[PDB]
mmCIF file of C-alpha atoms and ligand atoms in Angstrom:
data_model
loop_
_atom_site.group_PDB
_atom_site.id
_atom_site.type_symbol
_atom_site.label_atom_id
_atom_site.label_comp_id
_atom_site.label_asym_id
_atom_site.label_seq_id
_atom_site.Cartn_x
_atom_site.Cartn_y
_atom_site.Cartn_z
ATOM 1 C CA UNK A 7 0.005 -0.008 -0.011
ATOM 2 C CA UNK A 8 1.096 3.600 -0.722
ATOM 3 C CA UNK A 9 0.449 6.973 0.928
ATOM 4 C CA UNK A 10 -0.774 9.711 -1.362
ATOM 5 C CA UNK A 11 -1.159 13.396 -0.648
ATOM 6 C CA UNK A 12 -4.450 15.120 -0.042
ATOM 7 C CA UNK A 13 -5.656 18.260 1.760
ATOM 8 C CA UNK A 14 -8.536 18.600 4.212
ATOM 9 C CA UNK A 15 -11.613 20.289 2.729
ATOM 10 C CA UNK A 16 -13.907 19.590 5.700
ATOM 11 C CA UNK A 17 -14.128 17.080 8.501
ATOM 12 C CA UNK A 18 -17.684 15.649 8.260
ATOM 13 C CA UNK A 19 -18.268 13.213 11.077
ATOM 14 C CA UNK A 20 -16.381 10.515 12.948
ATOM 15 C CA UNK A 21 -15.490 8.349 9.915
ATOM 16 C CA UNK A 22 -16.120 10.581 6.840
ATOM 17 C CA UNK A 23 -14.007 13.517 5.773
ATOM 18 C CA UNK A 24 -14.082 15.680 2.643
ATOM 19 C CA UNK A 25 -10.647 15.811 1.014
ATOM 20 C CA UNK A 26 -9.115 17.180 -2.082
ATOM 21 C CA UNK A 27 -7.443 14.235 -3.782
ATOM 22 C CA UNK A 28 -5.604 14.581 -7.156
ATOM 23 C CA UNK A 29 -7.132 18.105 -7.288
ATOM 24 C CA UNK A 30 -10.759 16.930 -6.980
ATOM 25 C CA UNK A 31 -13.065 17.224 -3.923
ATOM 26 C CA UNK A 32 -14.240 13.915 -2.590
ATOM 27 C CA UNK A 33 -15.799 12.413 0.500
ATOM 28 C CA UNK A 34 -13.803 9.654 2.040
ATOM 29 C CA UNK A 35 -15.259 6.903 4.258
ATOM 30 C CA UNK A 36 -12.593 5.447 6.526
ATOM 31 C CA UNK A 37 -11.951 1.738 5.913
ATOM 32 C CA UNK A 38 -12.606 -0.938 8.579
ATOM 33 C CA UNK A 39 -14.297 1.259 11.130
ATOM 34 C CA UNK A 40 -17.748 2.410 12.270
ATOM 35 C CA UNK A 41 -18.222 5.456 14.450
ATOM 36 C CA UNK A 42 -21.664 6.267 16.077
ATOM 37 C CA UNK A 43 -23.899 8.680 14.112
ATOM 38 C CA UNK A 44 -23.602 12.274 15.355
ATOM 39 C CA UNK A 45 -27.068 11.671 16.776
ATOM 40 C CA UNK A 46 -25.958 8.568 18.869
ATOM 41 C CA UNK A 47 -23.978 8.126 22.031
ATOM 42 C CA UNK A 48 -20.251 9.001 21.410
ATOM 43 C CA UNK A 49 -21.212 10.386 17.939
ATOM 44 C CA UNK A 50 -20.260 13.933 18.770
ATOM 45 C CA UNK A 51 -17.034 12.824 20.484
ATOM 46 C CA UNK A 52 -16.060 10.695 17.424
ATOM 47 C CA UNK A 53 -16.841 13.679 15.142
ATOM 48 C CA UNK A 54 -14.812 16.017 17.341
ATOM 49 C CA UNK A 55 -11.933 13.614 17.503
ATOM 50 C CA UNK A 56 -11.591 13.151 13.731
ATOM 51 C CA UNK A 57 -12.101 16.923 13.214
ATOM 52 C CA UNK A 58 -9.266 17.887 15.550
ATOM 53 C CA UNK A 59 -7.035 15.175 14.268
ATOM 54 C CA UNK A 60 -7.461 16.140 10.618
ATOM 55 C CA UNK A 61 -7.718 19.907 11.095
ATOM 56 C CA UNK A 62 -4.489 20.032 13.154
ATOM 57 C CA UNK A 63 -2.469 17.913 10.731
ATOM 58 C CA UNK A 64 0.242 19.549 8.714
ATOM 59 C CA UNK A 65 0.063 16.676 6.209
ATOM 60 C CA UNK A 66 -2.979 14.490 5.314
ATOM 61 C CA UNK A 67 -2.356 11.324 3.277
ATOM 62 C CA UNK A 68 -4.686 8.806 1.825
ATOM 63 C CA UNK A 69 -3.859 5.156 1.536
ATOM 64 C CA UNK A 70 -6.109 2.947 -0.626
ATOM 65 C CA UNK A 71 -6.267 -0.753 0.125
ATOM 66 C CA UNK A 72 -6.122 -3.550 -2.478
ATOM 67 C CA UNK A 73 -9.789 -3.684 -3.460
ATOM 68 C CA UNK A 74 -12.681 -1.282 -4.019
ATOM 69 C CA UNK A 75 -11.547 2.416 -3.864
ATOM 70 C CA UNK A 76 -15.116 3.886 -3.971
ATOM 71 C CA UNK A 77 -18.259 2.597 -2.351
ATOM 72 C CA UNK A 78 -21.809 2.499 -3.674
ATOM 73 C CA UNK A 79 -22.305 6.091 -2.632
ATOM 74 C CA UNK A 80 -19.220 7.288 -4.540
ATOM 75 C CA UNK A 81 -17.325 7.837 -1.318
ATOM 76 C CA UNK A 82 -13.546 7.069 -1.421
ATOM 77 C CA UNK A 83 -12.571 4.075 0.822
ATOM 78 C CA UNK A 84 -9.099 4.554 2.375
ATOM 79 C CA UNK A 85 -6.965 4.663 5.420
ATOM 80 C CA UNK A 86 -6.427 8.320 6.265
ATOM 81 C CA UNK A 87 -3.177 9.570 7.974
ATOM 82 C CA UNK A 88 -2.727 12.877 9.907
ATOM 83 C CA UNK A 89 0.952 13.685 10.214
ATOM 84 C CA UNK A 90 1.771 10.014 9.821
ATOM 85 C CA UNK A 91 -0.804 8.677 12.364
ATOM 86 C CA UNK A 92 -3.691 6.622 11.009
ATOM 87 C CA UNK A 93 -7.007 8.178 12.008
ATOM 88 C CA UNK A 94 -8.813 4.830 11.460
ATOM 89 C CA UNK A 95 -6.561 3.125 14.026
ATOM 90 C CA UNK A 96 -6.674 6.094 16.384
ATOM 91 C CA UNK A 97 -10.479 6.225 16.562
ATOM 92 C CA UNK A 98 -10.530 2.473 17.364
ATOM 93 C CA UNK A 99 -7.741 2.814 19.970
ATOM 94 C CA UNK A 100 -9.812 5.444 21.722
ATOM 95 C CA UNK A 101 -12.997 3.408 21.724
ATOM 96 C CA UNK A 102 -14.731 5.979 19.539
ATOM 97 C CA UNK A 103 -15.208 3.426 16.660
ATOM 98 C CA UNK A 104 -15.654 -0.331 16.250
ATOM 99 C CA UNK A 105 -13.811 -2.476 13.761
ATOM 100 C CA UNK A 106 -16.657 -3.035 11.108
ATOM 101 C CA UNK A 107 -17.258 -3.407 7.372
ATOM 102 C CA UNK A 108 -14.404 -5.792 6.943
ATOM 103 C CA UNK A 109 -14.694 -7.027 3.414
ATOM 104 C CA UNK A 110 -12.157 -9.374 1.865
ATOM 105 C CA UNK A 111 -9.667 -7.663 -0.372
ATOM 106 C CA UNK A 112 -9.873 -4.320 1.537
ATOM 107 C CA UNK A 113 -8.615 -5.522 4.912
ATOM 108 C CA UNK A 114 -4.826 -5.040 4.998
ATOM 109 C CA UNK A 115 -4.947 -3.226 8.382
ATOM 110 C CA UNK A 116 -7.575 -5.471 9.995
ATOM 111 C CA UNK A 117 -5.268 -7.115 12.478
ATOM 112 C CA UNK A 118 -3.733 -3.837 13.600
ATOM 113 C CA UNK A 119 -7.113 -2.319 14.159
ATOM 114 C CA UNK A 120 -8.489 -5.353 16.053
ATOM 115 C CA UNK A 121 -5.427 -5.149 18.248
ATOM 116 C CA UNK A 122 -6.286 -1.495 19.033
ATOM 117 C CA UNK A 123 -9.893 -2.409 19.640
ATOM 118 C CA UNK A 124 -8.860 -5.123 22.123
ATOM 119 C CA UNK A 125 -6.844 -2.528 24.049
ATOM 120 C CA UNK A 126 -9.695 0.049 23.997
ATOM 121 C CA UNK A 127 -12.081 -2.627 25.182
ATOM 122 C CA UNK A 128 -9.697 -3.737 27.958
ATOM 123 C CA UNK A 129 -9.591 -0.109 29.134
ATOM 124 C CA UNK A 130 -13.361 0.113 28.967
ATOM 125 C CA UNK A 131 -12.890 3.263 26.856
ATOM 126 C CA UNK A 132 -15.799 5.365 25.539
ATOM 127 C CA UNK A 133 -18.003 2.858 23.537
ATOM 128 C CA UNK A 134 -16.766 0.052 25.781
ATOM 129 C CA UNK A 135 -17.410 1.757 29.099
HETATM 130 C C1 LIG B 201 -16.759 1.234 5.319
HETATM 131 C C2 LIG B 201 -17.530 0.730 4.125
HETATM 132 C C3 LIG B 201 -18.871 1.072 4.090
HETATM 133 N N1 LIG B 201 -19.636 0.691 3.010
HETATM 134 C C4 LIG B 201 -21.058 0.963 2.889
HETATM 135 C C5 LIG B 201 -21.801 -0.211 3.522
HETATM 136 C C6 LIG B 201 -23.010 0.440 4.119
HETATM 137 O O1 LIG B 201 -24.193 0.215 3.206
HETATM 138 P P1 LIG B 201 -25.616 0.705 3.744
HETATM 139 O O2 LIG B 201 -25.683 2.196 3.713
HETATM 140 O O3 LIG B 201 -26.435 0.126 2.665
HETATM 141 O O4 LIG B 201 -25.847 0.258 5.151
HETATM 142 C C7 LIG B 201 -22.643 1.885 4.373
HETATM 143 C C8 LIG B 201 -22.242 2.218 5.833
HETATM 144 O O5 LIG B 201 -21.583 3.468 5.840
HETATM 145 P P2 LIG B 201 -21.803 4.506 7.022
HETATM 146 O O6 LIG B 201 -21.382 3.723 8.273
HETATM 147 O O7 LIG B 201 -21.020 5.721 6.639
HETATM 148 O O8 LIG B 201 -23.272 4.781 7.040
HETATM 149 O O9 LIG B 201 -21.504 2.099 3.628
HETATM 150 C C9 LIG B 201 -19.008 -0.093 1.978
HETATM 151 O O10 LIG B 201 -19.726 -0.530 1.061
HETATM 152 N N2 LIG B 201 -17.677 -0.475 1.986
HETATM 153 C C10 LIG B 201 -16.926 -0.070 3.059
HETATM 154 O O11 LIG B 201 -15.741 -0.394 3.040
HETATM 155 CA CA1 LIG B 202 -20.818 5.549 10.822
#
């Protein structure tokens, strides 16, 4: 997998962000995770976490996996990095997302994320509390 440049356009909620990628605006859905809807418990905290993480980054990168790069809604499917730290993994580590939507072929970082979820769950963090 390879990191590609992109710039924040707008952080949308816990697991979707609008980015400019190859000069075009596009909404990205973070691979392998599910954050609560803004309306649900921990939804505003997940949104706020992704917003700070992405808004504070000097450098945003997108990393596509091996399979599908867009979903059925035209959203990009990627791992998103903020100054070298993976937002997908960070949300899970904090108990603000669950590992979810693991489809074969787009699951390179599954193990890493499950490992983070185990630690979040052990700590009874946020969603696990
Ligand atoms: C994360 C991810 C979501 N999706 C689709 C599945 C879900 O379809 P349905 O909308 O039909 O439930 C939806 C969940 O996204 P959200 O969690 O953003 O709503 O996005 C993919 O198809 N591939 C993916 O990798
Ligand atoms: Ca969601």
